[PDB]
Amino acid sequence: MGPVWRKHYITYRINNYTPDMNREDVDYAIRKAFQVWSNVTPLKFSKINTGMADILVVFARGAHGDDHAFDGKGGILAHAFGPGSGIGGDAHFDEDEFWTTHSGGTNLFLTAVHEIGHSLGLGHSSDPKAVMFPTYKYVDINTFRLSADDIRGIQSLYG
Ligand SMILES: COc1ccc(S(=O)(=O)N(CC(=O)NO)CC(C)C)cc1
Ligand SMILES: [Ca+2]
Ligand SMILES: [Ca+2]
Ligand SMILES: [Ca+2]
Ligand SMILES: [Zn+2]
Ligand SMILES: [Zn+2]
Structure with missing residues (x-):
């Protein structure tokens, strides 16, 4: 009749690569950040450095x-x-900051998960284990998962 994606396909693009780290790390952080949500949500993301994308990383x-x-x-x-x-869809990172892959200062991947969740379409959670919150809290990229709370929020991307 019929369904019915919203999106299904999330093509994304970076505009420039922060010099603070090596490019591979830069796309890696963001790649993984994307991949996080792509595991829980049915949203099928794809980074294309060449072509047209739905969203853009500024x-x-x-x-x-x-x-x-x-x-x-x-x-x-x-x-x-x-x-x-x-602008909606697009995600703007603090290049002026010195982001790190390791714990360091601010973790690129960590903030990325949060902003990329916004990109999906997430109204800020209110739980400190959740990553969607407006806050920041150091999380282990070892343990690497989302909160039960957060999982409700993200399933709310339909609807
Ligand atoms: C989970 O990763 C984050 C890192 C920093 C912040 S922030 O508090 O510095 N800030 C950016 C942000 O929340 N983006 O979605 C909000 C700002 C209003 C202080 C938020 C989330
Ligand atoms: Ca946009
Ligand atoms: Ca800043
Ligand atoms: Ca920088
Ligand atoms: Zn902006
Ligand atoms: Zn936010």
């Missing part, structure tokens, strides 16, 4: 055409949205 520094935008080390870690026009 890396700017300071004022990039937002009011708040940026603030160097701290403040906003990153800003992304799903269900909105224009």
